[PDB]
């Protein structure tokens, strides 16, 4: 089984290639990591396995989901610290994904009922609805397009949250730059209609993510930084005229950062375009991005045991992260190794607040 050969991710010796994909579950009540989270992660932690946390707020403005954890307060750091500890006692490596939704938010999720922030004032269309804290769905509002001063503050929010994660004992962080969220809103030319140094050209659209990655690499070291992108996805009206060129331009920026830092990023994490909330065209994009990036490649989005094995065997990826099957199979690593039957997942408790139901009461074998 290719998925169970060891893999060296920077300074981390992983014993297998099955990765817990980052997944918002909304159990971190009031944006504070809860003991529920620690049981949840401990359930899935394996000796030599890599875990990525649910997206985590870098600022009071970066939320667009209910009860998602933050890591911008010391209270959050201390509660995160207790979760990182039980993960490490199981022998796993854990990154914290840093997440700013940008315009994928609502007045209800913003301090003082303010507008969400973004690269543009273009709102997400009425094709998409936002889950509300009471379980209904709301209308995405028109965002505020931020200037370059505020952009630098957001970059610093990323840098401070990156240090706080280390303080909490995380092995590293992942920059969430995918899925139509704040960084994607700058990357994709379907969203970024700016006329300043952050918009227009492809280089300009790439400036935000480059600066975010540079700041966190400066902060904690390139080998503790992962980057997630999704140059082609159907999510929150996040489209580009030339997804593959956008992908390649991001990858070149990352290669350049690695050479100048003199160290490799922890990894590049890329969402398969088939994933939602032509086939060869989609596999083309993934292998084209992988072949272009100097370092470790995690693929994600609709993978199964079979698709995961082939991905590693065929050289398409170094690591494979699983999402939904990890929600419902806490010992998913164990099950993949044994090729044991997997347990179904219940979408309806993906985003509910219960600390047990649909969260930690999925059984082992
Ligand atoms: C409930 C749920 C929450 C998710 N939240 C995030 C997230 O916070 N950050 C992120 O990068 N991806 C998120 N995603 C996507 C996963 O990280 C992953 O890429 C995707 O689930 C992989 O496809 P799979 O479910 O078939 O394994 C989420 C997916 C699910 C099902
Ligand atoms: C389809 C890609 O978008 C996602 O999976 C997501 N966050 O990144 C959530 C919270 O659903």
Numbering used by the authors: 10 to 286, 297 to 384
What's the paper's own text on this?
In general, XenA structures showed a better-defined electron density for the substrate when prepared by soaking, while for OPR3, clearer results were obtained by co-crystallization. The propanoyl moiety of oxime 1b points into this cavity and is likely stabilized by hydrophobic interactions. Substrates with an acetyl moiety (such as oximes 1a and 1c) give the non-productive binding mode described above. Comparable experimental pKa values are reported for chemically similar oximes and for the 8-hydroxycoumarin and para-hydroxybenzaldehyde. Substrates of ene-reductases usually bind with the hydride-receiving atom within van der Waals distance from the N5 of the flavin and with an enzyme-dependent angle between the flavin N10–N5 axis and the atom receiving the hydride. In the cases mentioned above, none of these criteria are satisfied, and the binding modes very likely correspond to catalytically non-active complexes. Thus, we will refer to it as the “non-productive binding mode”. Remarkably, a non-canonical tyrosine residue was found to contribute to the catalytic activity of the ene-reductase OPR3, protonating the hydroxyl group of the oxime in the first reduction step. For OPR3, a non-canonical tyrosine residue was suggested as potentially catalytically relevant for the transformation of oxime substrates.
By studying the crystal structures of enzyme oxime complexes, analyzing molecular dynamics simulations, and investigating biocatalytic cascades and possible intermediates, we obtained evidence that the reaction proceeds via an imine intermediate and not via the hydroxylamine intermediate. All the crystal structures obtained had a high resolution (1.9–1.35 Å) and showed clear electron density features for the oximes.
